Write a protein that binds this DNA or RNA. Sequence first.
RNA 1: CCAUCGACCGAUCCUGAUGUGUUCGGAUGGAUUUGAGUAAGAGCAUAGCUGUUGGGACCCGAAAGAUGGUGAACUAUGCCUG
RNA 2: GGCGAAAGACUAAUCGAACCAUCUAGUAGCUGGUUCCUGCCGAAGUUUCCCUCAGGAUAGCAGAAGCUCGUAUCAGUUUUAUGAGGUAAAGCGAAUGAUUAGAAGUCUUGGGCUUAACUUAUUCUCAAACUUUAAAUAUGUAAGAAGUCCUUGUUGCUUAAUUGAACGUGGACAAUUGAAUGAAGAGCUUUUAGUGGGCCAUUUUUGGUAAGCAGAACUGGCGAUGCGGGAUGA
RNA 3: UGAUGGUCAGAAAGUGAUGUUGACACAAUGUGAUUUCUGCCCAGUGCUCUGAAUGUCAAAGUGAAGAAAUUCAACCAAGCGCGGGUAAACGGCGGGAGUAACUAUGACUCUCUUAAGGUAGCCAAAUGCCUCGUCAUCUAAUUAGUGACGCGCAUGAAUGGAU
RNA 4: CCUAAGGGGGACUCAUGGAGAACAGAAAUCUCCAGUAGAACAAAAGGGUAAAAGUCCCCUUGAUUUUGAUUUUCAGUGUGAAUACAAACCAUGAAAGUGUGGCCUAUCGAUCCUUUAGUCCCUCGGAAUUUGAGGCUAGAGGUGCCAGAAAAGUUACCACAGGGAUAACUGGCUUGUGGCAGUCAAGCGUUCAUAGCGACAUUGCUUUUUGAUUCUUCGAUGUCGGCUCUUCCUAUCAUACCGAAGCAGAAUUCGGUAAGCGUUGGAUUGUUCACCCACUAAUAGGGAACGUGAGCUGGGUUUAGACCGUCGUGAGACAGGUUAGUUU
RNA 5: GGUUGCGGCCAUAUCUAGCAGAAAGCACCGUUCCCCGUUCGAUCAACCGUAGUUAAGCUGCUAAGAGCAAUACCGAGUAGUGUAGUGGGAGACCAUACGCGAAACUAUUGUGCUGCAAUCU
RNA 6: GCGGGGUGGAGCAGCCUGGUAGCUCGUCGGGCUCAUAACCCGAAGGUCGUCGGUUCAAAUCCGGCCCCCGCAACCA
RNA 7: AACAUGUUCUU
RNA 8: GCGGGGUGGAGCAGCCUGGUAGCUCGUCGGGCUCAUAACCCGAAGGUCGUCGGUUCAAAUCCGGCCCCCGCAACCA
Lengths: 105, 159, 60, 218
Amino acid sequence: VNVPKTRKTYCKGKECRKHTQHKVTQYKAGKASLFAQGKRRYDRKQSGYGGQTKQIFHKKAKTTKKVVLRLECVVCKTKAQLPLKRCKHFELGGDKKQKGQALQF
Amino acid sequence: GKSRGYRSGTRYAFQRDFKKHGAIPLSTYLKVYKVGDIVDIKANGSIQKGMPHKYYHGKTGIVYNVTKSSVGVIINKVVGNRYIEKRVNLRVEHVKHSACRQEFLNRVKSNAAKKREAKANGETVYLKRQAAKPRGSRIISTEGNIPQTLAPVAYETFI
Amino acid sequence: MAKSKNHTAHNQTRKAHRNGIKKPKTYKYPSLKGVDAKFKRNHRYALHGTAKALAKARAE
Amino acid sequence: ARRPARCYRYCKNKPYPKSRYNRAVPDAKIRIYDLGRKKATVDEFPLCIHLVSNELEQLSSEALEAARICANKYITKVSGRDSFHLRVRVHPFHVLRINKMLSCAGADRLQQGMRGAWGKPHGLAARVSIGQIIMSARTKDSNKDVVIEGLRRARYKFPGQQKIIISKKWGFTPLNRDEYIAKKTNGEVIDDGAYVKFLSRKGNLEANLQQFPNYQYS
RNA sequence: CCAUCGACCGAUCCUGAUGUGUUCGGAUGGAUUUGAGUAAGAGCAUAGCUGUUGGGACCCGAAAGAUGGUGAACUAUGCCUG
RNA sequence: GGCGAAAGACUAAUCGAACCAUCUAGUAGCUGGUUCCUGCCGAAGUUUCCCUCAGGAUAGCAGAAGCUCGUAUCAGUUUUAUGAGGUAAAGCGAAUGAUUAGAAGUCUUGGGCUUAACUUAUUCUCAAACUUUAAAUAUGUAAGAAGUCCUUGUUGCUUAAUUGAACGUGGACAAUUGAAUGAAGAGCUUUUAGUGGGCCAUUUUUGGUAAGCAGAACUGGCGAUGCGGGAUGA
RNA sequence: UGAUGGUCAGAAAGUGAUGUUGACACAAUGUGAUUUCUGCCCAGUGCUCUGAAUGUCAAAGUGAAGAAAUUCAACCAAGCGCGGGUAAACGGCGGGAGUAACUAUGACUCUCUUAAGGUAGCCAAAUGCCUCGUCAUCUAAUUAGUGACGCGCAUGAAUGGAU
RNA sequence: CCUAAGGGGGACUCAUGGAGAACAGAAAUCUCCAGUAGAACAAAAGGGUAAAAGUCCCCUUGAUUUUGAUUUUCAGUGUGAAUACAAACCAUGAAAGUGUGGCCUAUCGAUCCUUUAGUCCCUCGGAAUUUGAGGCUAGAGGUGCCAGAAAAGUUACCACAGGGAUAACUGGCUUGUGGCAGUCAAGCGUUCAUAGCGACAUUGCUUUUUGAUUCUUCGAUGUCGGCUCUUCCUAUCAUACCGAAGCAGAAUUCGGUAAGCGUUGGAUUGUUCACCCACUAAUAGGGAACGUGAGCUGGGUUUAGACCGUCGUGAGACAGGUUAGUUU
RNA sequence: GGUUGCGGCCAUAUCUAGCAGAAAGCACCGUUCCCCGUUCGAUCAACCGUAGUUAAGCUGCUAAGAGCAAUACCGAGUAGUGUAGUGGGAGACCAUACGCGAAACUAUUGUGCUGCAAUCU
RNA sequence: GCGGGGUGGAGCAGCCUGGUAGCUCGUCGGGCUCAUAACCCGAAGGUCGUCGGUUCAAAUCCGGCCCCCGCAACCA
RNA sequence: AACAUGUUCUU
RNA sequence: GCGGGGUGGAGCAGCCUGGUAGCUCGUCGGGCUCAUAACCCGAAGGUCGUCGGUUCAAAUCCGGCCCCCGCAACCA
Ligand SMILES: CN[C@@H]1[C@@H](O)[C@@H](O[C@@H]2[C@@H](O)[C@H](O[C@H]3O[C@H]([C@@H](C)O)[C@@H](O)[C@H](O)[C@H]3N)[C@@H](N)C[C@H]2N)OC[C@]1(C)O
Ligand SMILES: CN[C@@H]1[C@@H](O)[C@@H](O[C@@H]2[C@@H](O)[C@H](O[C@H]3O[C@H]([C@@H](C)O)[C@@H](O)[C@H](O)[C@H]3N)[C@@H](N)C[C@H]2N)OC[C@]1(C)O
Ligand SMILES: CN[C@@H]1[C@@H](O)[C@@H](O[C@@H]2[C@@H](O)[C@H](O[C@H]3O[C@H]([C@@H](C)O)[C@@H](O)[C@H](O)[C@H]3N)[C@@H](N)C[C@H]2N)OC[C@]1(C)O
Ligand SMILES: CN[C@@H]1[C@@H](O)[C@@H](O[C@@H]2[C@@H](O)[C@H](O[C@H]3O[C@H]([C@@H](C)O)[C@@H](O)[C@H](O)[C@H]3N)[C@@H](N)C[C@H]2N)OC[C@]1(C)O
Ligand SMILES: CN[C@@H]1[C@@H](O)[C@@H](O[C@@H]2[C@@H](O)[C@H](O[C@H]3O[C@H]([C@@H](C)O)[C@@H](O)[C@H](O)[C@H]3N)[C@@H](N)C[C@H]2N)OC[C@]1(C)O
Ligand SMILES: CN[C@@H]1[C@@H](O)[C@@H](O[C@@H]2[C@@H](O)[C@H](O[C@H]3O[C@H]([C@@H](C)O)[C@@H](O)[C@H](O)[C@H]3N)[C@@H](N)C[C@H]2N)OC[C@]1(C)O
Ligand SMILES: [Zn+2]
């Protein structure tokens, strides 16, 4: 999968509400905070005696993930997220396919 | 493992007729459909958009909706111990008018005309159709038609 | 050890015909949910205007 | 070894030919279908005698091979090799399958029984209807009884019942003997090796007239 | 009571008047959206059969698990005296 | 816990973890039992999901209570009109694939007058996963009042439009209101039981040498059912 | 294991057993009289030693930022990792080709390869499938016995070998 | 898997064959003709496609935004996928049009938790500010046992609830396999198919082999062999009487009626089986719940002890070997 | 009746091989300043209708023509098939009763029809 | 039912992760030696078991088939 | 530093 | 019941897939030596163990008669 770095699509920002130029980057999840309620609950439940109190997933089966594109409008700086189909290789702004050239093995 | 995909089993049903491949004749696109029309559903394998499911292939139904390039058709489907009303969106390539209805509307017109003729004449006519009745009595002449006797023939081999 | 019958439709039509097979009831006016939104929108106004006109002519 | 023929006698299964879907199929035991003087002219062997199946069954290629050898050998011994033309008229295209259960003591330890029982190719058979010709021989009228006995011997090599029928037609042609003599004397037949070609009243008239120069247009 | 087209209240999307703690306000008009709503109340209480869930839960039935006690008059091993 | 010159031995007829009381009527998708009569109705072993496969939920089949009405339009059926289909059969000098035999050419193409190939007209035989053709049985739809015709109202939809589309006002057409036969009437709702091992026969049909074997299709049965016959027998 | 100890006990204790003891002792294992012997392997799993030099490493402590909760950074014990030893610790202990003046066989050679490639012995043995192995002896006749033979499915050295 | 292999427009025509052009030939590139698709279209197979859906050129991002309706699977729930509209905003084209990913039929994922985008909107409940936290809408991180527990063995020391819904005997169906008998007649048999044999084929029978199956029995039908004893079958080894011969005699071989009568003693082995020694008229084969354990025996198998080899880190395993093991 | 433009059904229209064709139309045909596209004015573009030609396209006719289409005292009431029986047969299978009913084969016939507009010896 | 092997005359790499067949010994030519071995300088030699498939490209990636050596075949 | 070998039988 | 095999004097090809049997060791001759050994040059040597069938054509396929060497042959 090669996806270009810029994309003219619809913008939902109240300033635009039209097709505008967007900057394309790949989404990456942030660091899990230690103060999210789910994590404060988990740490309290894990303290003391009793061992592991929650399940731990083991049977992984997927070999890929879904790629999320982060599109930022160059005008109002509103973002949009757009997920792609599963792929093993992804790059932004790779060099386009040239059609009809001799391979130089 | 078993396979029950959307077009499974349609190898022959969705084939085009022999020497009938290629472009659709434009008469298919010039027909006019109205809500209440009765239509036969026949999938055209060369038009992949707006296709019927194989269940509705060869079914007849009522038009209930008319859009840019397609009609909505109502079909009754036996599901268990009752019928379910189904609504199928079909591009016009997969649809055709039903001819029995045109015949029936013709009969409506003829019945009205005959009734009016009788009313102007001063009498009453019968408009109900009738099944074929047993034949009446008749006399058969034998002029140049003397009964000719036939017999069963003996067995012969020809191998 | 637990091999058993896999599938049959035996006795299934017999069960279906005890109380079926019933056609859905037909009505004079169908529901316009699922009809083209532009047609349905204008049909609303056409019915509204017709009632207003009949309510008018009946006065005179 | 080979199972007895009763295990594959009747047409119980759909035809199962060699194809893209069963490739590992052995050759039939019968390889030769035309014996005797197979280059003889149509007018040389006016008499046709058929061996006809009276069973709807399967004939193994082994039976076809044995019957062919028997009939050919007897007729060649009595009347010589050039006095007849024998044609096996069925070809074994149906593959026979086998499951191959072990015959040693304690096989039940080793094998799985009726689990996954789809069989391996085992042999080839020909599927014959009731009234289907199995073998055919054309010879001269004076060689009737020799060929009849030759086919009589070949019958015992086949399961079930078969009939030996003397045909009314000229050789292997579809014409009765009188019809063939009429077509011949009218210039409407020419030889084409072991067979003939008949006159057509269709198509290009110039080519028809050239091809049968002795044709009596009537 | 039923089929159907509307109207009203709340959620959602849009619009955005006189005005203003100039960032609030939200008049007015829209939208194949959404609600266990409105549109001249129907409920509350007692009782009965049937059905449901927790209870020993239709009756009898484990192999187990736990808490607190009683045994070396048999027998195992050491020690003491015969 | 002990004790074991070691057998998991012995530890009061108890030992691969004593005895006693209590928690304790421990839990059991499993086995057994489950107490009066008559009357009326009367099943299922199938669908989907489930660490589901000796179990549940879910839909179906069954009972009960009725309710709104009173011949309205309904039917495991025919007739008439009109669709769909690729099985049976058929076919292979028709496409694809398989397949026996000569013959005439071609030698410009490779061998030894040939030997094979190639081309042409022929010839024998085939296909669950081939096919031009193509049944029988089975299958969709229609046979009017919610209809037909005439005039012209509504609209923000539609047309170049005074065009249409959808829904209407007013007028007309009456028991042949537009085939047959039947109809202990039609419509509607709530609620809940059991069941979720099936099995047999004719026909179609898959695996298997075959089986009172294993697995599907439609219908009828047994299960749940006695009675006359088949001596006897679901 | 030299007592500020080893091995073991106890909920704890100003608590115990060995211990009225001290390496000719106590504690923990393996093998199993005598005779004759006890081969090679520390790559694996263990056990053990070394830490001046050293990647990672908790809580506390330290520094920075912030209004602060907090965040970030450095530093950082043992352990891990790095390096050495140890088989009477657990255990382990090879293939493919060619070659001598009849033939056969292969002392000899080539090659791949391990941590090491089963040594001394012993054997169809209570351990050998094939197998009732082959030869001999024993008998009229022996799937039995015994003696031999040994490319030994899968013998073998204190998981002790042979006597 | 693909920024094109998605969208729009345009131009062109593919496999293959024939005939021609320096190096050049079977295969280089150039020319013309024939060419219904015999090509190509990411990937299985089927369907579809020729002024295209294929090849090449040009421009693009509709692979976008909002939320409803529908089809398949179906409970007419979820998930996946798909269809036709409405309202926006765009691409392309002269234009009609076409486009909401890939020509169609597969290519995928709840609750809780975390994380991101949006409104920057709601809440932190004595009142406020700024941090922090919590909500609402839409995605991502994953459950492949794919409607979605967090999970290694061994028991030959064993337990319980059950199961003939299910294996290990007999019996029943079947008869492949085992065993026995026919039909034909290529050959063998000094000549001669059939005295005696008999290939290639082919029809059967039996239930003394072994399977296949799972109908009966798991609140139990005692599970090898031998010993003992009776009886039955005939597919006859001997004995009686006969027919045939490649029957001179002697001997032998093929066959018929025949089950009346007999069919043994021993070495090795737990053995059935096997194998020798020997006698004999002959040393036939089978059944009776694979006859026969309240008739025995207990060598074997198959509880608990113990040894070895190979395997296993280990507990332990082993249609591998070995020794000891209550028969009511 | 011919022809052109736009068509409907989409071979009775297609294919091969000959021949013929007045009027108009269509066509080939001439040219390259301009818009435009090419390696090439060949195709595409534009200009003239002026210099020519029915040679080709196109139309029709011919062929015991190939293909296609249609019919049938052709094959055949055959193959197949619904229903029935305590029918026949060891069975494979077969007949009968009440119904439905092919394909190949054979023979014969045909070879576009037509809508809207314009135009013509 | 599985698993590995198949590459110059011999024993082995290269596979994996496509674009070149590498190593030792051997064979052949010349040299050194009286000669031979050793040693020195040179040269040949595997279309990758086989039939297909895909790929622009096959020893390699994807199936069938052939040969060689092995593991598993348990509860009664 | 390296350096192995020389068919049989005589005249 | 099977599994291989029977080709010169002896070890092996040729078979898979019909037409075309070769090398190796060993014997019969010559070359070299003073004569041998070795070494080299040549030459003969198997109609395929046997009987059958298929075939235009069989070492090659399909049966039978022998010999060679083995793999498999209750049980509870
Ligand atoms: C905002 N657009 C509205 C459109 O939403 C719709 O209005 C719905 C209306 O149909 C719903 O009402 C519907 O559902 C209610 C039910 C909830 O009880 C019924 O009572 C009512 O009959 C039914 N029509 C009403 N609940 C909300 C409106 N916005 O009506 C058409 C419209 C005017 O375009
Ligand atoms: C006579 N006035 C009536 C008034 O009584 C009322 O009628 C309601 C009617 O609207 C309701 O019905 C309504 O709501 C139902 C409901 C199931 O959602 C809908 O299905 C239905 O379409 C809708 N019309 C009906 N259930 C009760 C009457 N009293 O509202 C409508 C009205 C015309 O104004
Ligand atoms: C012509 N097609 C026939 C089809 O009609 C049908 O034939 C049945 C036949 O099989 C029936 O016969 C069947 O049933 C009977 C009995 C139990 O009824 C049995 O005795 C008989 O063996 C059995 N074949 C016969 N009684 C009527 C025909 N229509 O089934 C057989 C078939 C060949 O397909
Ligand atoms: C200034 N006037 C505003 C008016 O614009 C409108 O505001 C809505 C606001 O309510 C919506 O927001 C609403 O819905 C979102 C969510 C469900 O999308 C919620 O997060 C939010 O708390 C809720 N108020 C917002 N998304 C758009 C504004 N125009 O209504 C609220 C208001 C205050 O009157
Ligand atoms: C008492 N001694 C006898 C001894 O005589 C001999 O007996 C055989 C016997 O074994 C044979 O029998 C054997 O062999 C026949 C085969 C030949 O048909 C088999 O059918 C049978 O089952 C088998 N037991 C039998 N046919 C003859 C006796 N003399 O061998 C067995 C024995 C027990 O040792
Ligand atoms: C030692 N070199 C020899 C060379 O001498 C020759 O050898 C022949 C050999 O081929 C012959 O061998 C041949 O002989 C005749 C041939 C002449 O037709 C054949 O009939 C025979 O079958 C075949 N073996 C053999 N008879 C003599 C050797 N010297 O050819 C072979 C060879 C190996 O190169
Ligand atoms: Zn923006």
